[PDB]
Symmetry: D2
């Protein structure tokens, strides 16, 4: 019928076009109300109760703001109402594929449960989106508002997941090269500067109790479309380059303080463990009454629709003896009897730990031979080793090298700015790894032992000296001259 207004604490009163309202009011979308944005983060930051639902609204809203701003300043781009709606829909829908506790599901659980599969929430989102459209008769409604479902559905999916085919050249079918800038708004594959980040910076900061340093409204006011290598791309004003570096700094701060908090991560790990032990016994009904498992619900969207943070409580409140082991792990979370953090270290020089080796790392720590008297001996299964990749979104690459700028005196001429033209106080590297070790045996003597193994292992591998190394393992740290 007409627009709805929604009050969001981050963006204020947001207007939603009636087509967007139709998409929102479906089981597939409403599911996001039962998925925590930050997963296990809520168990450390009690303000982080927010869910993927409200984040999706914000992304949809901001995507609209940017495409409206570009059209208003540059009418010659011929941005249509159709374009605007398609960008908003992609914005709303890019989080549809998230599973229970968000990054826990595709970052920890699926890789362990279905190692062979290559699953990302992005692929999930496209499949969920297709299911949403077809199950709810949205195509007719799209037609009613001037959309062309064949080309526009393709455009929406491409915004979320990138080109759906091998092109080998313009690889996209939803829109031509003169509308290339539209693909940079929701999920920016070139440099990661998109409206998804801008919403979560402000939303997560508001809920976590941390203040956000990046100003997205400012960026929107200064954004322009310019020709770059025969594409029309979004360009930023030159003098905003400092702010872009700060945006990635902020992202990295948020990961350090919150998203990769050592305890938040161990809770995610414990929940994943419970899910693995429950995976043979939980049944989720999908299409035609068929039953799926937590690990196979990703193969049927009807089942996946019903896969939310509810699984946690279904296990916790179960009485089935088959779920006893899964239930016991979750109960340990309630009593705060967590696996204990031992410490953190990093590889030095060039060392980079591969995913294929993650499984062997607890074995290595347990194989260390600290020269200290120990009452207890620990085994591989008593250790957890978490490897964390921290970067500016593009592996070792500087994403600001993939941004186009313009100057005040020549607004149509795109230019490049190098790091050395900005500041000497910027990072010289853009990627790193952290290694955390935890112990499943929580008593005083086990933990003392775990610390000696860990510090010995760091010494043997030539990793960095843990910050508290001299205090937790005063007999071990002297043997390493590099640390003294």
């Amino acid at each position: 019928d007409t627009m709805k207004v929604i009050n969001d604490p981050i963006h204020g009163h947001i207007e939603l076009h009636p087509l967007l309202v139709r998409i929102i009011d479906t089981p597939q979308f409403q599911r996001l109300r039962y998925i925590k944005q930050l997963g296990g983060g809520y168990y450390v930051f009690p303000g982080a109760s927010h869910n993927r639902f409200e984040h999706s609204l914000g992304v949809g809203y901001l995507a609209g703001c940017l495409v409206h701003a570009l059209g208003e300043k540059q009418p010659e781009l011929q941005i249509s109402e159709r374009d605007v709606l398609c960008v908003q829909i992609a914005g709303l829908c890019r989080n549809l594929g998230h599973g229970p506790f968000s990054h826990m599901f595709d970052g920890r659980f699926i890789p362990l449960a279905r190692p062979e599969v290559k699953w990302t929430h992005e692929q999930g989102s496209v499949m969920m989106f297709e299911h949403l459209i077809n199950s709810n008769g949205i195509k007719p409604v799209m037609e009613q508002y001037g959309l062309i479902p064949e080309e526009d559905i393709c455009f929406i999916k491409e915004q979320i997941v990138g080109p759906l085919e091998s092109p080998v050249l313009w690889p996209y079918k939803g829109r031509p090269e003169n509308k290339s800038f539209l693909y940079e708004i929701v999920s920016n594959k070139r440099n990661g500067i998109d409206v998804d980040k801008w919403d979560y910076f402000a939303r997560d900061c508001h809920h976590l109790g941390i203040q956000n340093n990046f100003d997205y409204k400012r960026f929107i006011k200064f954004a322009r479309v310019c020709e770059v290598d025969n594409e029309l791309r979004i360009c930023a004003r030159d003098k905003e380059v400092g702010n872009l570096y700060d945006m990635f700094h902020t992202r990295n701060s948020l990961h350090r303080r919150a998203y990769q908090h050592k305890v938040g991560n161990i809770i995610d790990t414990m929940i994943t463990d419970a899910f693995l032990k429950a995976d043979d016994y939980i049944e989720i009904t999908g299409a035609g009454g068929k039953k799926y498992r937590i690990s196979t619900a990703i193969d049927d969207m009807e089942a996946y629709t019903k896969l939310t943070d509810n699984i946690f409580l279904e296990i916790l409140y179960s009485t089935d003896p088959k779920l006893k082991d899964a239930r016991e792990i979750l109960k340990q979370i309630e009593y705060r009897n967590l696996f204990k953090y031992v410490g953190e270290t990093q590889p030095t020089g060039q060392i980079k730990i591969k995913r294929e080796d993650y499984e062997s790392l607890p074995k290595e720590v347990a194989s260390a031979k600290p020269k200290v008297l120990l009452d207890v001996k620990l085994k591989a299964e008593d250790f957890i080793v978490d490897v964390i990749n921290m970067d500016y979104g593009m592996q070792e690459k500087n994403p600001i090298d993939h941004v186009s700028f313009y100057c005040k005196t020549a607004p149509n001429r795109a230019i490049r700015i190098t790091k050395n033209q900005v500041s000497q106080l910027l990072p010289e590297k853009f990627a790193e790894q952290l290694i955390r070790v935890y112990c499943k045996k929580v008593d005083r003597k086990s933990l003392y032992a775990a610390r000696q193994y860990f510090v010995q292992w760091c010494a043997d591998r030539n990793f960095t000296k843990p910050q508290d190394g001299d205090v937790i393992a005063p007999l071990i740290t002297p043997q390493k001259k590099e640390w003294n």
Copy 2:
């Protein structure tokens, strides 16, 4: 040692290790799965907050106030023991909340167990006792200098009131300690201060009451042979504003017409599921949603999860309950028709609520209608709005002191403050909704409703002339 927790409202809060022990139990952690505002989240998408974080905030603020009083007035002899008991009461006053908070004890239990008299306060005391006993907390209390017999009694009394000086947990010289967590005299307590700031932060509305200011100006003075908390005289304006803010929040958010109808629909689903959902309590015995309040072990497991258990069920027995919840997901909600109030001296009684849909359906609007509606097509929601004390002004039950005589308590009347304040402190709103959502039904529903208002002499609905132009002229009182 102490844990530090980062709360978005209060910042970094320090928690004494005994509080940490109480928090890290199934009975307390349960509050992570209970939305503060129930169905409000379905209208204000920022309101994702749960009872858990609110409880921390209350416990913190209760500590702030008692610490402040002890610091300024050492002669009160506030002990570390007192402080901890007030913080524990603060942490634990929300323990008795059920699924979707006020939906559960405000709508569901009254309909499901009309004979019973249940409040979340009573729930909290029972849950607290169960928490203590199930988790071996008494020894730990002893270890930090608490005396469980007296102090458990003190804590419960802070939450629910007395189970002469009617209290056993502390004597009259510590009377002021009973005003911090749940203030039975006038409702000015740290529970409100936390939810004002927390709800505002999540709802996207700005809070006008400054509790830090209040804490700086609070003193204990003798009032009728009790030591009570007294506010500085100048602060009386801020107190009126505190209640105004509360009433605003209810108007805009807690009693939002759609939030309420969603709570109503969820309640309906729970009623239809109540025969079939089984909750295991003590000794393996099975309970229903409506009887889980009789066993704390079962109640521990009763959270917002029930909603999703019903929604995702495949059992044909749960078909009807599941259908209602699915209507919520598609946003096929019962439609709001309008709102009115009783005029003059009319007050609608709880005993009459059930007859009201019948009355609306019996109205005979003189207009041509395609469809005829029945009682079962109408929902009538009666909402009591007040300043927390029925028709009473709660500021009449506050004690103040002046700068020139800080130990002398005084009273301030409404007329000494402002003529721009309310003359009444309680009122009723009547909302009507229609279960039939099509265009013709809605048209008809509007004519019935306005006719009914006219017949009953209720206030003219705001949009009355637009929704029912043939009906409103017949009433001269309305023009």
Copy 3:
């Protein structure tokens, strides 16, 4: 010339059309950087350092937001870019007439210095605006952007001061654009963008939280026909929010704008200005010299009249300015006139402006019947009378608001108080009376308290809140108390 972006802490990044930039970059406008929004309030709330300049930008911005919103939702209104600019200009320029310390100047100083004259900041704003336009060659620039100076200047002035009888009293725009006159300074009911900026700005600086959401209001606003005018109508649902908006305004007055100490500091500054008024010279047009009290007669002199006068007096060495300087120095040492107490007239009693001068005499004429060391005279008392209302004297402004319903968006309606709530005020205006004493020693203050409470008893005013404590021998004689 292109658009400038400006970062405001309240509104974020605001875009300004180049014509607005031209108006801003003049002595007449830049003057507002040197005038405190809240006058003496800064001496009580140290966060309130903000000036009229930034407030004006905000008003100009919000006026643009609203007129843009209306044009986007209802293209049939035929709002032109010309209309938008004229509304923004009126928004920017409605504060131009403010004098030193804002409301101190026209609320206290001018009435005392020039009792014969009838001056308001609104009239000041129109005169300043005219002077700004003419002194800076703005008329040609206006023509360059499609404005028609004859009509549009008239329109801008009318937005600020109202019509310069009749169904339609305005000349700048016709009745089909009536809704444009409701944006910047709403004479019908006071619901305008000026309030929305200062609620959010003052709250941000004072450390108080604002409960009115103007962005919400903009989203729900529509233009409808009302009595053959096109007016702005609010959605029916929003009527509660409008009552709250006036409650918030009254809260802010109670807590901040009429703070008892902020007011006494304004009074002291006014006193210093009065004592300096013979000696301070301000050069206006053609080199003529003016006084602080006559600078309002020449805009060139008025342009140079800012909070700077305060410091010019404070730092003076001239013996002629000794008395003015001593008062201000008492402010620095915080040796202020002492607050005695506050009371109200009962029920429906109102004091009027003509009587204000006789009030110190009355207090001094009270005969307490308590033993006193010192006797006080009329000149030792200050009596401040404060009118608190919902912006329209005894009237309910919500009675002058038009609403619309969801089911009939083009049909305007009225909503009465009884259709909203029984918990609303039954009265919309009241007076406070504050008494202060210029003699600050312990014995004088004790005496002042007895006179004051006796006077309250004699006049049948309300019992001061601390009456029993400050005057325990006086309050028993009144059984009603």
Copy 4:
């Protein structure tokens, strides 16, 4: 005298001890109400109307919060009420020496007006403090609250300016940590920064990412090389790096905004041209100039942002030139920014050379056709030192930490134990060039000289170099 409560938008309701109230209610302190925190920043960020007065209150408050926190957690430090009050007084009083438009005065005006003198706001503050105490009979009042004026006044001054082997006389080595609260000379981590981060962010419309309340909760005193120092929890090292990053951001975006700086420069110019004619009465009726008022505190007391308006509203023909410059600010006819570059070479341009830089730019010989020829006096060259507060040094190397398992044992954490994503350098210089000739042809020319000069000196390629000077940038192969 009892405690006063004051409502600050940043900190909320702050309680002030009556002795602090007595210090605040003096001409010497109240003067800070008339001095903008950010100077010419207000002319770019209209929210930045805040003055030094409210910042001083915030610093005094936070200094009290921290010393109270330390005493409460570690009674064995023997912090007295006397210690607390002295730290709060230093906190309140460290801004007393600021002149008109804050950093404009001692960063630009005094160096140009009195090149021979060595003046800082810190020295100003100690002299103002002494004058405040003596003019207002504060010593007796101090005694009344348990202070010992001889030792405590010395302590307060030392906290502000440093020492006038253990070099301090106000307190012994076991109270070393008290000298780290208000102006931390060891590493710059102090409560002054925390207040201005939050205050400036609130007014500028930028959000602050350092949490000082968190830091206070985790701070401890530990023994380090026979001194008792403040130590941070090991975990918090990341937050400290972020604190300095925030400081640098704020300088980049706001404190050193290219236009805010040019406005300060123009105001400085006007002050220079007014300095012979403005008279400020000091002690015994002696007259001082703006540039000599720093020699007499009675005169300096009266030296505030008011000078700006006294000049602007003057009618004296002698002040005509000063008045014209300020009027150009009102009409926004500013000196025009030409561009920004940095040295590539490791030697910092020295303060002694600043004067010769306009001459160098004017001596560049761009190979381009130019209508107009520019002279040295048409160029302004502003050299800006950006660092982490300690020249080339990493201030986190001068921070002590402690671990959860051994809270009294201080440790060091090196940059490599924290992250590879941190800066490799901690100091740099920016060079901004502006032109006093604002017409289109002069500005075109200025751009060619500037880029040519960058090329000749081997400075970095200006960001817009290829657009402003397309004929000049190709000649430098390094720039591609």
